[PDB]
From a paper:
Translation of viral mRNAs by the host ribosome requires 5′ capping, and the necessary mRNA caps are cleaved or “snatched” from host pre-mRNAs. This “cap-snatching” mechanism begins with the binding of PB2 to the cap of a host pre-mRNA, followed by the cleavage of the pre-mRNA by the endonuclease functionality. Two groups found that the endonuclease activity resides not in PB1 as previously suggested but in an independently folded N-terminal domain of PA ([name]).
Importantly, the active site residues are virtually superimposable, two metal ions are clearly present, and the dose-dependent endonuclease activity is unaffected by the truncations. Previous structural studies raised the question as to whether there is a single Mg2+ ion or two Mn2+ ions in the [name] active site. Because of this uncertainty, we included both 10 mM MgCl2 and 5 mM MnCl2 in our crystal soaking solutions. ΔLoop–Apo crystals soaked in a solution containing only 5 mM MnCl2 revealed strong electron density in both metal sites. Second, refinements of all our structures consistently favored Mn2+ over Mg2+ ions to account for the observed electron densities. ΔLoop–Apo and move to 3.8–4.0 Å apart when an inhibitor is bound. This mobility seems to occur in Mn2 because Mn1 is in a similar location in both the unbound and inhibitor-bound structures. Our data suggest that the inhibitor-bound form of [name] represents the enzyme-substrate complex stage in which the metals are separated by about 4.0 Å. [name] contains a large, deep active site (over 3000 Å3) with several ordered water molecules, 17 of which are found in at least three of the four [name] molecules in the asymmetric unit.
Author numbering: 1 to 50, 50A, 50B, 50C, 73 to 196, 196A, 196B, 196C
The structure:
């Protein structure tokens, strides 16, 4: 799975995923399913931010934690928006809300509810994607146009297929279940 990951995702994403795992004492060489999952989440977040007009989104995911919180603080102080209890992934300047992006090998609603109960926010928008083409978002407000979401859905299905091709999909799907 480690070698698959390193040829599936761009080096910039792979590098960000390794840094994030080390900060949590996780070895990318051993917890390779987590490694794939983290890269996938990064790629989706970056694809999503590209789906809007040029200036639309502040990107929080992929930043160093301290600077991430600094940018979050800048947004909150300048917009009035409630400060999230956990680091969100993007801030949407058009809709004026933080966005938590999820990617799940489980059902979208199960994951959605876990995320909603965790963050405890009446403001932060939640948008969940699956490896089956399903999506679920706060109030059925999907933020992006259909085209931008579809591209993301397509990419996730390709990753799933590329994994299944190598006999890695079953283990990858099961890993999230065991973790939860
Ligand atoms: Mn996140
Ligand atoms: Mn996320």
């Amino acid at each position: 799975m480690e070698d698959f990951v390193r040829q599936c995702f761009n080096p910039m994403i792979v590098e960000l995923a390794e840094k994030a795992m080390k900060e949590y004492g996780e070895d990318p060489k051993i917890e390779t399913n987590k490694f794939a999952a983290i890269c996938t989440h990064l790629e989706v977040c970056f694809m999503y931010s590209d789906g809007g007009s040029k200036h639309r989104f502040e990107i929080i995911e992929g930043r160093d934690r301290t600077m991430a919180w600094t940018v979050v603080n800048s947004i909150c102080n300048t917009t009035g928006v409630e400060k999230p209890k956990f680091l969100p992934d993007l801030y949407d300047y058009k809709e004026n809300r933080f966005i938590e992006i999820g990617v799940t090998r489980r059902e979208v609603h199960t994951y959605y509810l876990e995320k909603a109960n965790k963050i405890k926010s009446e403001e932060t928008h939640i948008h969940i994607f699956s490896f089956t083409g399903e999506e679920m978002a706060t109030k059925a407000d999907y933020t992006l146009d259909e085209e931008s979401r579809a591209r993301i859905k397509t990419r996730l299905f390709t990753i799933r297929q590329e994994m299944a091709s190598r006999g890695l999909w079953d283990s990858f799907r099961q890993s999230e279940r065991a973790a939860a």
